[PDB]
C-alpha cells in the first residue's frame with residue numbers, strides 16, 4: 078500500500094538490515110520464508126491472552142529450592158504493599174495467589190494489580206506467590222518484597238498492525254571457473270576446486286578439478302560426475318565448493334531447494350574467505366561483497382522429481398549408547414545401531430548416535446528412517462532432556478524430520494526454561510539447512526507469546542544481524558516476523574532502545590578514538606563527552622527506554638555529571654541514568670557501561686552458560702552466588718554491560734594498599750571486607766557470600782577452560798560477592814585451573830597448607846557443585862561444543878571441543894572426581910601468586 082512502506086523502513090531500522098534487499102541472493106528462499114512465517118505469527122498473535130501478555134508474569138513450576146525455605150519455612154511471606162504515601166505490610170502463605178491478596182488485603186482495609194516497586198514486573202495470574210521469580214529473587218538476596226497496588230495496563234496498546242529423463246543418473250556439476258578482482262600476494266601458485274556433497278557435516282562423496290595456475294581468472298569448464306545418484310540426494314544436502322592452493326575460500330549451495338526442487342541453472346557464487354569446524358562454513362548465504370570477493374561459476378543441469386537382540390550384542394549396544402556425545406562411532410558401532418534400530422528406538426539417549434549411523438546418501442535408507450520415525454512412541458513419552466534435545470540440533474544433523482522431533486520436545490519447555498536456553502537455541506538456527514524451520518517457527522512463537530522472551534529474542538537476533546554477514550539474512554527475516562506481531566507498545570520500546578543505542582554509538586564514535594596507549598583520559602576528552610551528551614539530553618534521547626539486559630527497568634534521564642570515559646584501552650563510556658520510575662524503592666542511578674570496538678557475543682555466550690550452571694545447582698539445592706551481570710551485544714561491535722553497584726576489581730584492592738607492584742599481600746582482601754562492612758553481622762555474612770561465590774567461579778571457570786585469569790579480570794562487591802568479568806580478552810587474542818590465591822584463602826581462615834571451618838566448607842561446596850555439573854555432563858558438553866562452533870571463529874577444532882570431557886572427568890566416578898577437583902584446589906594452593914605475578918609481568922608491563 079502506502080503507509081505499509083513507511084512501516085517497512087521502521088522495521089528496517091529496528092532490524093539493522095533491509096529484508097527486501099535482493100542484491101545478494103540467487104533464489105527466492107528468503108522472500109519465500111517471510112511468506113511462510115505469516116501463518117505461525119498470526120496464529121500466535123490471535124492465540125495469546127491479551128491481559129496476560131500485556132503483563133508477562135514471570136513464574137516457575139520448579140520446586141522452591143530448600144535454601145529459600147530457610148527464610149520462610151514458617152509459611153509466612155511478608156509483602157510491603159505501597160500506595161501514594163501510605164503503605165502496609167502483610168503476612169502471606171507461600172500458596173496465596175495474587176488474586177487472593179484482596180481477601181487478605183482489602184478486608185484488612187477487585188480490578189487492581191500487584192506491580193513490583195520501580196519495575197515493569199507484575200505479580201498476577203493463578204500462580205502461587207512462592208513461584209514468582211521476583212519473589213524468589215528477594216528471598217535469595219534477603220530483600221523486602223515491595224509492590225505497588227495499581228491498575229493493569231491497557232492491552233489495546235499491544236494492537237498488532239493489520240497487515241495483509243536423468244532422475245536415476247549420477248549427480249553431476251560443471252565447474253566453469255573462478256574469478257577474483259585482485260590477488261598478488263606471492264609468486265605463481267597452483268589452485269583447484271573441491272566439490273563435496275554434504276549432509277550434516279559428513280561428506281557423501283567428493284570430486285576435484287585438475288589443478289591450474291592461480292590467475293585473476295581460472296577456467297575449467299569440466300563436468301564432475303559423482304558417485305551418488307540424483308534420486309539419492311537427501312533433502313538438505315549441500316554442494317560445498319572449496320578452493321585450495323591450502324584452503325582459501327568456500328561457498329555452499331543447497332542441492333534441494335525450499336520447494337522440494339532439485340537445483341538447476343547457472344550460478345555465480347561469491348565465496349567467503351578463510352583466515353588460516355565453525356558454523357559459518359555451513360551457511361547457504363553468499364558473500365555480499367562482490368567488488369572484492371572470489372566467485373565461482375557453475376552449471377547444474379539435472380532433472381526430477383522382529384527378532385529380539387541377543388545378550389552379548391545387547392551389551393555392546395548399551396556400552397555405545399552410554400558414551401559421551403564427543404566419541405566417534407566406528408563403522409561397527411553404526412552397523413550395530415542401524416541393524417538393531419528398533420532396539421535403539423527404545424533408548425531416547427541413543428537418538429543422536431542412531432541418527433549419525435543413517436546413510437543419508439541412500440534414499441531407501443532415509444525411507445526406513447522415516448518408517449522408523451513414525452513409531453517414536455518412547456520419544457514422545459520421554460522426559461524432556463534438553464542436552465539430548467540440543468544434540469539433535471547441532472551440525473551433525475541435517476534431516477528436517479530428525480530436527481523437527483527435537484523441536485517437538487522443546488514445545489514442553491516452560492517460559493523460564495526457554496529464557497535459559499534462548500541464546501543457544503537462537504545460535505542453533507545456524508545449523509538449519511533452510512531459512513524456514515521448525516526451530517525458527519518455535520522461537521518466533523515463544524517470543525510472540527511472552528514479552529520477556531520477545532525482548533531477548535529481539536536483541537539476540539539483532540546482535541547476529543549486526544556482526545554476522547554469514548547469517549544476517551536468515552536472522553533478519555526471523556526478526557521481521559517477530560516485530561510484525563510483538564505489538565505497538567513493544568515496537569515503541571524497541572524504537573526507544575535502538576534510538577538511544579545509535580545515539581550512544583555516535584557519541585562514542587566521536588569521543589572514543591582519542592587515546593592509543595592505556596591510561597590517558599584528560600579534561601579535553603571528558604569536555605567532549607559531557608558536551609555531546611549535553612546536546613543529546615536536550616529533547617533527543619527518548620523520554621526513557623527499557624534496559625536491554627534488564628527489560629523490567631526503565632532508564633530515564635542521563636546524569637551527565639556522573640558520566641565519564643573509563644581508564645581502560647577501548648575507552649568504554651561509564652553512563653549513569655536516573656530511573657524513570659517514581660515508585661522505585663530508592664535513589665540509586667542505573668549504571669551502564671557502553672562499549673564499542675568489541676564483538677560482545679562471546680561474552681553473552683559465557684554469561685548464559687553461567688546462568689545455566691546456576692540452574693543446575695538449584696536442582697541440587699545449591700546456591701553458588703554467581704553474579705552473571707547484564708551483557709547484551711547491541712549492534713556492530715557495540716554493547717551494553719551492567720555495572721554492579723559497589724564493586725572493584727581484585728587488582729585494585731591489592732593496588733590501593735601496596736601499589737603498582739606484584740608484591741601482593743595476603744591480608745588486603747579481608748582487610749577491605751572488614752573495612753567496607755559496617756556491623757560484624759554484615760562482615761560475617763560477607764565472608765560467607767565470599768565462600769560461596771568463590772567456590773562458584775572456581776568450578777564454573779575450570780569447567781569452561783577460562784579459570785586462568787589475571788586478577789584485574791576479577792571483581793568483588795563490598796558484600797563479599799566475587800565475580801569474573803571481560804571474557805573476551807582470553808577468548809579473543811606455567812599456568813593454573815582457576816583462581817584460589819592467598820588473599821581468598823586469608824578470608825576463609827588460612828595461609829599456606831593449613832585448614833579451617835570456612836576453607837573446609839569451601840572445599841565441600843566445590844565438590845558438591847562440581848559433581849552436580851557432572852550429573853549434566855552430556856548437556857554441558859553439547860552446550861560448550863555448540864558455543865565454540867557459533868561463538869568463536871578461532872577455537873573450532875575437535876581438540877578444543879574435547880577440553881571439557883577431561884574437565885568433567887567423563888567416565889570416572891564421583892569418588893575419583895572428588896579427588897580430581899581437590900587436586901586442582903591443590904595446584905592452586907601450591908602456587909600462591911606465581912601466576913598472578915606472571916600475569917602482572919605479562920599483561921601490566923609487556924613481558
Ligand SMILES: Cc1ccc([C@@H](C)Nc2c(C(N)=O)cnc3ccc(C#N)cc23)cc1
Pocket residue numbers: 643645649670672706718719720721724725726802803804
Ligand atoms: C569495558 C569495561 C571493562 C571492565 C570494567 C571493570 C574494570 N569495571 C566494572 C565495574 C566498575 N566499578 O568499574 C563495575 N561493574 C562491572 C561489571 C562488569 C564488567 C565487565 N566485563 C566490568 C565492571 C569496566 C568497563
